[PDB]
Write a protein that binds this ligand. Structure first.
Ligand code: CU
Length: 166
């Protein structure tokens, strides 16, 4: 169990630690760390919730529904906080393509992978800091999809992150 704290994930922003910058987020208000589903679950319109019961409100998609963190292109520091550390296989990051439609359901086919970090089947610290590159053809509102792949289960944790690139 874990979430991306910086830039705050959509779920994290629903919690008091995240400033309640997103409202009406279901279970994310209290447990943004709990978006767990089998690896390679990418159901269109169910990316933000990973299809998990109680997280459905996260799946709404409009240009103005969610709080964005202002960022630039180039290097971006990602910080995870893990409430329950687990042996780790992988960390993968995706971002919406230039030209994507922010008023349509999220579809992984409209994202590119932009980073992949091997967990080496070790147990990470409770705070995990990584640096990824935001491609320079992205401007404005984009969604980063951060995926923590567990090493000793068939599951992963899924974190949609709303950013405004300028
Ligand atoms: Cu866990």
């Amino acid at each position: 169990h874990g979430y991306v704290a910086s830039p705050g994930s959509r779920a994290f922003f629903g919690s008091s630690a995240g400033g309640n910058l997103n409202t009406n987020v279901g279970r994310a208000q209290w447990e943004p760390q709990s978006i767990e589903a089998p690896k390679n679950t990418f159901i269109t319109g169910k990316l933000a919730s990973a299809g998990v019961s109680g997280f459905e409100p996260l799946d709404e998609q409009t240009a103005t529904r969610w709080h964005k963190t202002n960022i630039t292109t180039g290097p971006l520091d990602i910080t995870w906080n893990l409430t329950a550390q687990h042996r780790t296989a992988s960390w993968d990051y995706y971002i919406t393509k230039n030209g994507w439609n922010p008023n349509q359901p999220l579809d992984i086919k409209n994202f590119d992978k932009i980073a992949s970090i091997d967990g080496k089947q070790e147990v990470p610290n409770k705070v995990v800091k990584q640096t990824i590159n935001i491609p320079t053809d992205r401007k404005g509102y984009h969604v980063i999809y951060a995926v923590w792949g567990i090493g000793d289960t068939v599951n992963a944790f899924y974190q949609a992150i709303d950013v405004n690139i300028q």
